[PDB]
Amino acid sequence: MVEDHYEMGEELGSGQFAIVRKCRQKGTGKEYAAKFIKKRRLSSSRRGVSREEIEREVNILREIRHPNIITLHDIFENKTDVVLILELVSGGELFDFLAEKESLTEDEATQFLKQILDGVHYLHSKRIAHFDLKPENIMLLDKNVPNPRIKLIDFGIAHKIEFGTPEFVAPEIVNYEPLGLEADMWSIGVITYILLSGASPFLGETKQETLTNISAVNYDFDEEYFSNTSELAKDFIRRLLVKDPKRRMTIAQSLEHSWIKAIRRRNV
Ligand SMILES: CN1CCC2(CC1)NC(=O)c1c(c3ccc(Cl)c(Cl)c3n1C)[C@H]2C#N
């Protein structure tokens, strides 16, 4: 059993069918995050996570080796749960960081985005789409520094290309059209808008209104939030928030973009 080898500690987070606890590996003293995923009782049960979601997630994490993506250390399973022993990331979600900061400067935003884009470049090079990129799925190593390091998490709907969270889904998801790596690029555009403004671009009062806004690409650079934003930043976002996935910037193009490079290019 997992608890023979890992002493479980405080609960760090929870969702509908998962709980994550801090734990300590008894043999080494090393601390990890143990994610307990509740299995379906029966193969096609309504409640619980499909065994397919679990195995697919495990297999993707085991194949990835990148500094901006969480590592999987081990796996345990009993009758009711699959327990993933994951790298512990203790600086909280980017979501909570942003909550405290309200909105980021373009320099602060690009420092995060360089890391997010590097991790996504690694995934896309392997033809893996994450499909649930959002600030809640980006963890900080340490929140009390100017340039915090991040790791992508929650690969539960990641797929190899051969419905995530309403505010972040691309139009092709909303309209049941073919999916690819481009959906992740849309989500990066949403993240970028949020980092710079503190506002979610497509959010409506209801989920239905949010989804309607996405499909119509109904957003703006409202002067409330974007009165000081550079034309480069807007170009970056505008080239991601495009309805036709074929027209959207690719991950390589996003990394080459002058906005991302601006901070590297300048001295002061
Ligand atoms: C998608 N959201 C965010 C991640 C989620 C599940 C719900 N929630 C967590 O609170 C959380 C999760 C984590 C997953 C991995 C690691 Cl290494 C950590 Cl520190 C995680 N934490 C803190 C997710 C779960 N369950």
PDB file of C-alpha atoms and ligand atoms in Angstrom:
ATOM      1  CA  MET A   1       0.000   0.000   0.000  1.00  0.00           C
ATOM      2  CA  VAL A   2       1.032   3.590  -0.694  1.00  0.00           C
ATOM      3  CA  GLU A   3       0.779   4.581   2.952  1.00  0.00           C
ATOM      4  CA  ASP A   4       3.393   1.924   3.836  1.00  0.00           C
ATOM      5  CA  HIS A   5       5.942   3.961   1.855  1.00  0.00           C
ATOM      6  CA  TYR A   6       4.604   7.475   1.978  1.00  0.00           C
ATOM      7  CA  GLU A   7       3.387   9.176   5.114  1.00  0.00           C
ATOM      8  CA  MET A   8       0.380  11.289   4.105  1.00  0.00           C
ATOM      9  CA  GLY A   9       0.060  14.807   5.352  1.00  0.00           C
ATOM     10  CA  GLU A  10      -2.080  17.826   4.669  1.00  0.00           C
ATOM     11  CA  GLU A  11      -4.591  18.143   1.914  1.00  0.00           C
ATOM     12  CA  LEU A  12      -3.326  20.560  -0.729  1.00  0.00           C
ATOM     13  CA  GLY A  13      -6.292  20.528  -3.107  1.00  0.00           C
ATOM     14  CA  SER A  14      -9.341  18.785  -4.332  1.00  0.00           C
ATOM     15  CA  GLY A  15     -11.621  18.365  -7.248  1.00  0.00           C
ATOM     16  CA  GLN A  16     -14.725  16.342  -8.083  1.00  0.00           C
ATOM     17  CA  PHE A  17     -12.895  12.960  -8.273  1.00  0.00           C
ATOM     18  CA  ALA A  18      -9.437  13.741  -6.922  1.00  0.00           C
ATOM     19  CA  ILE A  19      -7.695  14.826  -3.790  1.00  0.00           C
ATOM     20  CA  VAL A  20      -4.058  15.848  -3.503  1.00  0.00           C
ATOM     21  CA  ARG A  21      -2.103  15.450  -0.235  1.00  0.00           C
ATOM     22  CA  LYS A  22       1.419  16.400   0.680  1.00  0.00           C
ATOM     23  CA  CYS A  23       3.384  13.300   1.616  1.00  0.00           C
ATOM     24  CA  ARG A  24       6.782  12.179   2.731  1.00  0.00           C
ATOM     25  CA  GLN A  25       8.648   9.228   1.285  1.00  0.00           C
ATOM     26  CA  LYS A  26       9.644   7.264   4.345  1.00  0.00           C
ATOM     27  CA  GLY A  27      12.883   5.858   2.876  1.00  0.00           C
ATOM     28  CA  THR A  28      14.402   9.229   1.922  1.00  0.00           C
ATOM     29  CA  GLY A  29      12.468  11.972   3.633  1.00  0.00           C
ATOM     30  CA  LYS A  30      11.662  13.548   0.269  1.00  0.00           C
ATOM     31  CA  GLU A  31       8.338  15.281   0.013  1.00  0.00           C
ATOM     32  CA  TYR A  32       5.880  14.701  -2.856  1.00  0.00           C
ATOM     33  CA  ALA A  33       2.295  15.403  -3.833  1.00  0.00           C
ATOM     34  CA  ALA A  34       0.087  12.339  -3.751  1.00  0.00           C
ATOM     35  CA  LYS A  35      -2.891  12.671  -6.110  1.00  0.00           C
ATOM     36  CA  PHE A  36      -5.677  10.212  -5.244  1.00  0.00           C
ATOM     37  CA  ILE A  37      -7.875   9.670  -8.293  1.00  0.00           C
ATOM     38  CA  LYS A  38     -11.180   7.942  -7.642  1.00  0.00           C
ATOM     39  CA  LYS A  39     -11.779   5.044  -9.968  1.00  0.00           C
ATOM     40  CA  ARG A  40     -15.082   4.136 -11.546  1.00  0.00           C
ATOM     41  CA  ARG A  41     -16.689   1.175  -9.803  1.00  0.00           C
ATOM     42  CA  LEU A  42     -17.713  -0.252 -13.143  1.00  0.00           C
ATOM     43  CA  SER A  43     -16.007   0.296 -16.491  1.00  0.00           C
ATOM     44  CA  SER A  44     -18.602   2.769 -17.800  1.00  0.00           C
ATOM     45  CA  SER A  45     -19.849   4.131 -14.384  1.00  0.00           C
ATOM     46  CA  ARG A  46     -21.047   7.741 -14.416  1.00  0.00           C
ATOM     47  CA  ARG A  47     -18.998   8.586 -11.296  1.00  0.00           C
ATOM     48  CA  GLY A  48     -15.223   8.322 -11.056  1.00  0.00           C
ATOM     49  CA  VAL A  49     -12.463   8.800 -13.461  1.00  0.00           C
ATOM     50  CA  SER A  50     -12.305   6.521 -16.376  1.00  0.00           C
ATOM     51  CA  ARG A  51      -9.521   4.045 -16.254  1.00  0.00           C
ATOM     52  CA  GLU A  52      -8.650   5.411 -19.755  1.00  0.00           C
ATOM     53  CA  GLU A  53      -8.182   8.942 -18.444  1.00  0.00           C
ATOM     54  CA  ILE A  54      -5.878   7.506 -15.708  1.00  0.00           C
ATOM     55  CA  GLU A  55      -3.658   5.311 -17.898  1.00  0.00           C
ATOM     56  CA  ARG A  56      -3.405   7.957 -20.622  1.00  0.00           C
ATOM     57  CA  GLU A  57      -2.337  10.576 -18.021  1.00  0.00           C
ATOM     58  CA  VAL A  58       0.211   8.249 -16.431  1.00  0.00           C
ATOM     59  CA  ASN A  59       1.657   7.289 -19.789  1.00  0.00           C
ATOM     60  CA  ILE A  60       1.992  10.907 -20.934  1.00  0.00           C
ATOM     61  CA  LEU A  61       3.686  11.993 -17.675  1.00  0.00           C
ATOM     62  CA  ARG A  62       6.111   9.067 -17.822  1.00  0.00           C
ATOM     63  CA  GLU A  63       7.228  10.082 -21.317  1.00  0.00           C
ATOM     64  CA  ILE A  64       7.835  13.730 -20.567  1.00  0.00           C
ATOM     65  CA  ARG A  65      11.159  15.091 -19.295  1.00  0.00           C
ATOM     66  CA  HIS A  66      11.023  18.913 -19.120  1.00  0.00           C
ATOM     67  CA  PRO A  67      11.812  21.471 -16.377  1.00  0.00           C
ATOM     68  CA  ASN A  68       8.419  23.189 -16.805  1.00  0.00           C
ATOM     69  CA  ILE A  69       6.317  20.027 -16.539  1.00  0.00           C
ATOM     70  CA  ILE A  70       5.603  18.104 -13.351  1.00  0.00           C
ATOM     71  CA  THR A  71       7.276  14.722 -12.936  1.00  0.00           C
ATOM     72  CA  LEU A  72       5.650  11.469 -11.928  1.00  0.00           C
ATOM     73  CA  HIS A  73       7.662   9.554  -9.337  1.00  0.00           C
ATOM     74  CA  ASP A  74       5.498   6.462  -8.751  1.00  0.00           C
ATOM     75  CA  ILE A  75       2.025   4.977  -8.947  1.00  0.00           C
ATOM     76  CA  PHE A  76      -0.021   2.913  -6.477  1.00  0.00           C
ATOM     77  CA  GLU A  77      -3.408   1.433  -6.896  1.00  0.00           C
ATOM     78  CA  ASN A  78      -5.908  -0.265  -4.737  1.00  0.00           C
ATOM     79  CA  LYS A  79      -9.547  -1.264  -5.342  1.00  0.00           C
ATOM     80  CA  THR A  80     -10.836   2.355  -5.218  1.00  0.00           C
ATOM     81  CA  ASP A  81      -8.071   4.814  -6.106  1.00  0.00           C
ATOM     82  CA  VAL A  82      -5.099   5.223  -8.297  1.00  0.00           C
ATOM     83  CA  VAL A  83      -2.510   7.304  -6.394  1.00  0.00           C
ATOM     84  CA  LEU A  84       0.036   9.262  -8.405  1.00  0.00           C
ATOM     85  CA  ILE A  85       3.153  10.297  -6.508  1.00  0.00           C
ATOM     86  CA  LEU A  86       4.034  13.564  -8.200  1.00  0.00           C
ATOM     87  CA  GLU A  87       6.734  16.153  -7.800  1.00  0.00           C
ATOM     88  CA  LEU A  88       5.769  18.547  -5.018  1.00  0.00           C
ATOM     89  CA  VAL A  89       5.338  22.144  -6.171  1.00  0.00           C
ATOM     90  CA  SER A  90       4.727  24.343  -3.129  1.00  0.00           C
ATOM     91  CA  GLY A  91       4.332  27.912  -4.430  1.00  0.00           C
ATOM     92  CA  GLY A  92       0.633  27.544  -5.256  1.00  0.00           C
ATOM     93  CA  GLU A  93      -1.277  27.993  -8.478  1.00  0.00           C
ATOM     94  CA  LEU A  94      -0.589  30.790 -10.946  1.00  0.00           C
ATOM     95  CA  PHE A  95      -4.327  31.477 -10.415  1.00  0.00           C
ATOM     96  CA  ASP A  96      -3.692  32.435  -6.765  1.00  0.00           C
ATOM     97  CA  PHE A  97      -0.546  34.398  -7.597  1.00  0.00           C
ATOM     98  CA  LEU A  98      -2.508  36.456 -10.117  1.00  0.00           C
ATOM     99  CA  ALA A  99      -5.307  36.914  -7.657  1.00  0.00           C
ATOM    100  CA  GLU A 100      -2.894  38.656  -5.257  1.00  0.00           C
ATOM    101  CA  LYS A 101      -1.123  40.688  -7.953  1.00  0.00           C
ATOM    102  CA  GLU A 102      -4.365  41.576  -9.800  1.00  0.00           C
ATOM    103  CA  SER A 103      -2.619  42.017 -13.130  1.00  0.00           C
ATOM    104  CA  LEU A 104       0.952  41.693 -14.339  1.00  0.00           C
ATOM    105  CA  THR A 105       3.274  44.032 -16.164  1.00  0.00           C
ATOM    106  CA  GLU A 106       4.209  42.946 -19.660  1.00  0.00           C
ATOM    107  CA  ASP A 107       7.657  41.945 -18.349  1.00  0.00           C
ATOM    108  CA  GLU A 108       6.154  39.833 -15.565  1.00  0.00           C
ATOM    109  CA  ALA A 109       3.681  38.232 -18.011  1.00  0.00           C
ATOM    110  CA  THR A 110       6.368  37.407 -20.567  1.00  0.00           C
ATOM    111  CA  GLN A 111       8.580  35.834 -17.911  1.00  0.00           C
ATOM    112  CA  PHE A 112       5.778  33.398 -17.136  1.00  0.00           C
ATOM    113  CA  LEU A 113       4.836  32.914 -20.770  1.00  0.00           C
ATOM    114  CA  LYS A 114       8.371  32.027 -21.822  1.00  0.00           C
ATOM    115  CA  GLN A 115       8.182  29.082 -19.384  1.00  0.00           C
ATOM    116  CA  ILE A 116       4.622  28.070 -20.331  1.00  0.00           C
ATOM    117  CA  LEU A 117       5.508  28.253 -24.024  1.00  0.00           C
ATOM    118  CA  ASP A 118       8.656  26.199 -23.469  1.00  0.00           C
ATOM    119  CA  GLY A 119       6.690  23.476 -21.779  1.00  0.00           C
ATOM    120  CA  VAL A 120       4.022  23.550 -24.462  1.00  0.00           C
ATOM    121  CA  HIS A 121       6.707  23.482 -27.202  1.00  0.00           C
ATOM    122  CA  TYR A 122       8.030  20.297 -25.643  1.00  0.00           C
ATOM    123  CA  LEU A 123       4.559  18.732 -25.605  1.00  0.00           C
ATOM    124  CA  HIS A 124       3.717  19.841 -29.144  1.00  0.00           C
ATOM    125  CA  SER A 125       7.026  18.488 -30.453  1.00  0.00           C
ATOM    126  CA  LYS A 126       5.706  15.065 -29.337  1.00  0.00           C
ATOM    127  CA  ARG A 127       2.242  15.895 -30.757  1.00  0.00           C
ATOM    128  CA  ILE A 128       0.771  16.000 -27.262  1.00  0.00           C
ATOM    129  CA  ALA A 129      -2.080  18.474 -26.676  1.00  0.00           C
ATOM    130  CA  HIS A 130      -2.700  19.375 -23.053  1.00  0.00           C
ATOM    131  CA  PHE A 131      -6.282  20.496 -23.621  1.00  0.00           C
ATOM    132  CA  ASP A 132      -6.714  22.129 -20.187  1.00  0.00           C
ATOM    133  CA  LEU A 133      -4.235  24.954 -20.008  1.00  0.00           C
ATOM    134  CA  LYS A 134      -5.328  27.623 -17.509  1.00  0.00           C
ATOM    135  CA  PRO A 135      -3.805  29.390 -14.482  1.00  0.00           C
ATOM    136  CA  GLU A 136      -5.179  26.792 -12.053  1.00  0.00           C
ATOM    137  CA  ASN A 137      -3.099  24.107 -13.901  1.00  0.00           C
ATOM    138  CA  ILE A 138       0.183  26.030 -13.670  1.00  0.00           C
ATOM    139  CA  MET A 139       2.008  25.722 -10.334  1.00  0.00           C
ATOM    140  CA  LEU A 140       4.740  27.989  -8.966  1.00  0.00           C
ATOM    141  CA  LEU A 141       7.914  26.612  -7.346  1.00  0.00           C
ATOM    142  CA  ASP A 142       8.229  29.681  -5.112  1.00  0.00           C
ATOM    143  CA  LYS A 143       5.799  32.633  -5.006  1.00  0.00           C
ATOM    144  CA  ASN A 144       8.075  35.134  -3.092  1.00  0.00           C
ATOM    145  CA  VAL A 145      10.471  36.099  -5.923  1.00  0.00           C
ATOM    146  CA  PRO A 146      10.341  38.444  -8.933  1.00  0.00           C
ATOM    147  CA  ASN A 147      10.541  35.754 -11.670  1.00  0.00           C
ATOM    148  CA  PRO A 148       8.905  32.570 -10.269  1.00  0.00           C
ATOM    149  CA  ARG A 149       9.451  29.234 -11.906  1.00  0.00           C
ATOM    150  CA  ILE A 150       6.425  27.243 -13.036  1.00  0.00           C
ATOM    151  CA  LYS A 151       5.343  23.712 -13.864  1.00  0.00           C
ATOM    152  CA  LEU A 152       2.378  22.528 -15.870  1.00  0.00           C
ATOM    153  CA  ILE A 153       0.106  20.027 -14.155  1.00  0.00           C
ATOM    154  CA  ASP A 154      -3.102  18.081 -14.635  1.00  0.00           C
ATOM    155  CA  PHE A 155      -2.692  15.975 -17.724  1.00  0.00           C
ATOM    156  CA  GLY A 156      -6.040  14.269 -17.224  1.00  0.00           C
ATOM    157  CA  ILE A 157      -7.390  15.293 -20.647  1.00  0.00           C
ATOM    158  CA  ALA A 158      -4.073  15.454 -22.514  1.00  0.00           C
ATOM    159  CA  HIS A 159      -4.012  13.474 -25.768  1.00  0.00           C
ATOM    160  CA  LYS A 160      -1.614  12.606 -28.545  1.00  0.00           C
ATOM    161  CA  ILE A 161      -2.788  14.113 -31.877  1.00  0.00           C
ATOM    162  CA  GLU A 162      -2.327  11.539 -34.635  1.00  0.00           C
ATOM    163  CA  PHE A 163     -14.046  19.487 -23.254  1.00  0.00           C
ATOM    164  CA  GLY A 164     -11.922  21.403 -20.766  1.00  0.00           C
ATOM    165  CA  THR A 165     -12.842  24.517 -18.783  1.00  0.00           C
ATOM    166  CA  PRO A 166     -15.475  26.835 -20.388  1.00  0.00           C
ATOM    167  CA  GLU A 167     -13.524  30.105 -20.190  1.00  0.00           C
ATOM    168  CA  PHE A 168     -10.452  28.554 -21.886  1.00  0.00           C
ATOM    169  CA  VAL A 169     -11.881  26.268 -24.588  1.00  0.00           C
ATOM    170  CA  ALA A 170     -11.291  27.072 -28.208  1.00  0.00           C
ATOM    171  CA  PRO A 171     -14.142  27.565 -30.721  1.00  0.00           C
ATOM    172  CA  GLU A 172     -13.509  24.123 -32.257  1.00  0.00           C
ATOM    173  CA  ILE A 173     -14.235  22.565 -28.890  1.00  0.00           C
ATOM    174  CA  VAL A 174     -17.449  24.602 -28.550  1.00  0.00           C
ATOM    175  CA  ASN A 175     -18.544  23.684 -32.100  1.00  0.00           C
ATOM    176  CA  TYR A 176     -17.550  20.004 -32.069  1.00  0.00           C
ATOM    177  CA  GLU A 177     -15.000  20.424 -34.831  1.00  0.00           C
ATOM    178  CA  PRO A 178     -11.698  18.582 -35.348  1.00  0.00           C
ATOM    179  CA  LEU A 179      -9.190  19.113 -32.568  1.00  0.00           C
ATOM    180  CA  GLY A 180      -5.453  19.441 -32.622  1.00  0.00           C
ATOM    181  CA  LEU A 181      -2.511  21.270 -31.030  1.00  0.00           C
ATOM    182  CA  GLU A 182      -4.135  24.578 -31.966  1.00  0.00           C
ATOM    183  CA  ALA A 183      -6.603  24.441 -29.078  1.00  0.00           C
ATOM    184  CA  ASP A 184      -3.727  24.828 -26.669  1.00  0.00           C
ATOM    185  CA  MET A 185      -2.607  27.934 -28.560  1.00  0.00           C
ATOM    186  CA  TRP A 186      -6.023  29.499 -28.117  1.00  0.00           C
ATOM    187  CA  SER A 187      -5.885  28.744 -24.402  1.00  0.00           C
ATOM    188  CA  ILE A 188      -2.483  30.461 -24.233  1.00  0.00           C
ATOM    189  CA  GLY A 189      -4.084  33.545 -25.748  1.00  0.00           C
ATOM    190  CA  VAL A 190      -6.785  33.460 -23.032  1.00  0.00           C
ATOM    191  CA  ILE A 191      -4.133  33.068 -20.322  1.00  0.00           C
ATOM    192  CA  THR A 192      -2.160  35.967 -21.755  1.00  0.00           C
ATOM    193  CA  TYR A 193      -5.220  38.248 -21.760  1.00  0.00           C
ATOM    194  CA  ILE A 194      -5.895  37.347 -18.138  1.00  0.00           C
ATOM    195  CA  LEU A 195      -2.318  37.929 -17.049  1.00  0.00           C
ATOM    196  CA  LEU A 196      -2.288  41.428 -18.511  1.00  0.00           C
ATOM    197  CA  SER A 197      -5.780  42.529 -17.469  1.00  0.00           C
ATOM    198  CA  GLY A 198      -7.004  40.434 -14.575  1.00  0.00           C
ATOM    199  CA  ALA A 199     -10.135  39.805 -16.652  1.00  0.00           C
ATOM    200  CA  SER A 200     -11.226  36.735 -18.521  1.00  0.00           C
ATOM    201  CA  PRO A 201     -11.888  37.749 -22.148  1.00  0.00           C
ATOM    202  CA  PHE A 202     -14.947  35.648 -23.022  1.00  0.00           C
ATOM    203  CA  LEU A 203     -16.537  35.335 -19.589  1.00  0.00           C
ATOM    204  CA  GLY A 204     -20.250  35.919 -19.509  1.00  0.00           C
ATOM    205  CA  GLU A 205     -22.761  35.828 -16.713  1.00  0.00           C
ATOM    206  CA  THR A 206     -23.666  32.251 -17.602  1.00  0.00           C
ATOM    207  CA  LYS A 207     -21.667  29.349 -19.006  1.00  0.00           C
ATOM    208  CA  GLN A 208     -23.832  29.503 -22.116  1.00  0.00           C
ATOM    209  CA  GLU A 209     -22.983  33.184 -22.678  1.00  0.00           C
ATOM    210  CA  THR A 210     -19.239  32.419 -22.195  1.00  0.00           C
ATOM    211  CA  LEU A 211     -19.431  29.662 -24.795  1.00  0.00           C
ATOM    212  CA  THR A 212     -21.381  31.877 -27.157  1.00  0.00           C
ATOM    213  CA  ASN A 213     -18.707  34.582 -26.802  1.00  0.00           C
ATOM    214  CA  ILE A 214     -15.966  32.046 -27.585  1.00  0.00           C
ATOM    215  CA  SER A 215     -17.636  30.831 -30.744  1.00  0.00           C
ATOM    216  CA  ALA A 216     -18.185  34.393 -31.960  1.00  0.00           C
ATOM    217  CA  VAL A 217     -14.672  35.433 -30.880  1.00  0.00           C
ATOM    218  CA  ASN A 218     -16.394  38.169 -28.993  1.00  0.00           C
ATOM    219  CA  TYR A 219     -13.654  39.924 -26.980  1.00  0.00           C
ATOM    220  CA  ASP A 220     -12.085  43.328 -26.948  1.00  0.00           C
ATOM    221  CA  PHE A 221      -9.043  45.135 -25.576  1.00  0.00           C
ATOM    222  CA  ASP A 222     -11.206  47.262 -23.297  1.00  0.00           C
ATOM    223  CA  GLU A 223      -9.447  50.511 -22.342  1.00  0.00           C
ATOM    224  CA  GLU A 224     -10.370  49.782 -18.682  1.00  0.00           C
ATOM    225  CA  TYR A 225      -7.483  47.242 -18.685  1.00  0.00           C
ATOM    226  CA  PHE A 226      -5.461  47.823 -21.820  1.00  0.00           C
ATOM    227  CA  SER A 227      -4.994  51.573 -21.887  1.00  0.00           C
ATOM    228  CA  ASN A 228      -1.212  51.152 -21.479  1.00  0.00           C
ATOM    229  CA  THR A 229      -0.642  47.840 -23.255  1.00  0.00           C
ATOM    230  CA  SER A 230       1.833  47.699 -26.102  1.00  0.00           C
ATOM    231  CA  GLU A 231       0.807  47.036 -29.656  1.00  0.00           C
ATOM    232  CA  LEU A 232       3.174  43.985 -29.529  1.00  0.00           C
ATOM    233  CA  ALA A 233       1.261  42.441 -26.640  1.00  0.00           C
ATOM    234  CA  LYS A 234      -1.986  42.974 -28.454  1.00  0.00           C
ATOM    235  CA  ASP A 235      -0.539  41.439 -31.635  1.00  0.00           C
ATOM    236  CA  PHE A 236       0.473  38.354 -29.679  1.00  0.00           C
ATOM    237  CA  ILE A 237      -2.964  37.872 -28.209  1.00  0.00           C
ATOM    238  CA  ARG A 238      -4.795  38.743 -31.438  1.00  0.00           C
ATOM    239  CA  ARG A 239      -2.822  36.105 -33.380  1.00  0.00           C
ATOM    240  CA  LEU A 240      -3.847  33.418 -30.855  1.00  0.00           C
ATOM    241  CA  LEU A 241      -7.519  34.319 -30.392  1.00  0.00           C
ATOM    242  CA  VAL A 242      -8.474  33.408 -33.950  1.00  0.00           C
ATOM    243  CA  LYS A 243     -11.464  31.253 -34.778  1.00  0.00           C
ATOM    244  CA  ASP A 244      -9.899  29.224 -37.613  1.00  0.00           C
ATOM    245  CA  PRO A 245      -7.326  26.959 -35.926  1.00  0.00           C
ATOM    246  CA  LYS A 246      -5.302  26.900 -39.188  1.00  0.00           C
ATOM    247  CA  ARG A 247      -4.735  30.673 -38.902  1.00  0.00           C
ATOM    248  CA  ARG A 248      -3.672  30.657 -35.277  1.00  0.00           C
ATOM    249  CA  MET A 249       0.020  31.058 -34.357  1.00  0.00           C
ATOM    250  CA  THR A 250       1.762  27.729 -33.718  1.00  0.00           C
ATOM    251  CA  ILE A 251       3.873  27.185 -30.662  1.00  0.00           C
ATOM    252  CA  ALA A 252       7.102  27.778 -32.635  1.00  0.00           C
ATOM    253  CA  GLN A 253       5.703  31.043 -34.006  1.00  0.00           C
ATOM    254  CA  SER A 254       4.622  32.172 -30.549  1.00  0.00           C
ATOM    255  CA  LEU A 255       8.135  31.625 -29.193  1.00  0.00           C
ATOM    256  CA  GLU A 256       9.551  33.669 -32.105  1.00  0.00           C
ATOM    257  CA  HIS A 257       7.135  36.491 -31.527  1.00  0.00           C
ATOM    258  CA  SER A 258       8.689  39.910 -30.844  1.00  0.00           C
ATOM    259  CA  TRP A 259       6.637  40.400 -27.680  1.00  0.00           C
ATOM    260  CA  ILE A 260       8.081  37.267 -26.086  1.00  0.00           C
ATOM    261  CA  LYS A 261      11.542  38.229 -27.221  1.00  0.00           C
ATOM    262  CA  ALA A 262      11.266  41.923 -26.168  1.00  0.00           C
ATOM    263  CA  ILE A 263      12.541  41.420 -22.627  1.00  0.00           C
ATOM    264  CA  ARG A 264      15.561  39.383 -23.893  1.00  0.00           C
ATOM    265  CA  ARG A 265      16.381  41.925 -26.593  1.00  0.00           C
ATOM    266  CA  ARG A 266      16.558  45.061 -24.438  1.00  0.00           C
ATOM    267  CA  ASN A 267      19.009  46.127 -21.750  1.00  0.00           C
ATOM    268  CA  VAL A 268      16.936  48.550 -19.669  1.00  0.00           C
TER     269      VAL A 268
HETATM  270  C1  LIG B   1      -7.500  21.524 -12.070  1.00  0.00           C
HETATM  271  N1  LIG B   1      -7.551  22.050 -10.690  1.00  0.00           N
HETATM  272  C2  LIG B   1      -6.211  22.514 -10.310  1.00  0.00           C
HETATM  273  C3  LIG B   1      -5.263  21.348 -10.058  1.00  0.00           C
HETATM  274  C4  LIG B   1      -5.818  20.322  -9.060  1.00  0.00           C
HETATM  275  C5  LIG B   1      -7.175  19.860  -9.568  1.00  0.00           C
HETATM  276  C6  LIG B   1      -8.105  21.060  -9.744  1.00  0.00           C
HETATM  277  N2  LIG B   1      -6.017  21.021  -7.775  1.00  0.00           N
HETATM  278  C7  LIG B   1      -5.044  21.160  -6.811  1.00  0.00           C
HETATM  279  O1  LIG B   1      -5.325  21.799  -5.799  1.00  0.00           O
HETATM  280  C8  LIG B   1      -3.786  20.614  -7.067  1.00  0.00           C
HETATM  281  C9  LIG B   1      -3.676  19.663  -8.070  1.00  0.00           C
HETATM  282  C10 LIG B   1      -2.364  19.297  -8.119  1.00  0.00           C
HETATM  283  C11 LIG B   1      -1.791  18.391  -8.963  1.00  0.00           C
HETATM  284  C12 LIG B   1      -0.452  18.189  -8.852  1.00  0.00           C
HETATM  285  C13 LIG B   1       0.288  18.861  -7.898  1.00  0.00           C
HETATM  286 CL1  LIG B   1       1.961  18.436  -7.987  1.00  0.00          CL
HETATM  287  C14 LIG B   1      -0.299  19.782  -6.987  1.00  0.00           C
HETATM  288 CL2  LIG B   1       0.602  20.660  -5.794  1.00  0.00          CL
HETATM  289  C15 LIG B   1      -1.668  20.017  -7.163  1.00  0.00           C
HETATM  290  N3  LIG B   1      -2.568  20.771  -6.531  1.00  0.00           N
HETATM  291  C16 LIG B   1      -2.256  21.705  -5.446  1.00  0.00           C
HETATM  292  C17 LIG B   1      -4.830  19.197  -8.948  1.00  0.00           C
HETATM  293  C18 LIG B   1      -5.491  18.052  -8.328  1.00  0.00           C
HETATM  294  N4  LIG B   1      -6.048  17.145  -7.898  1.00  0.00           N
END
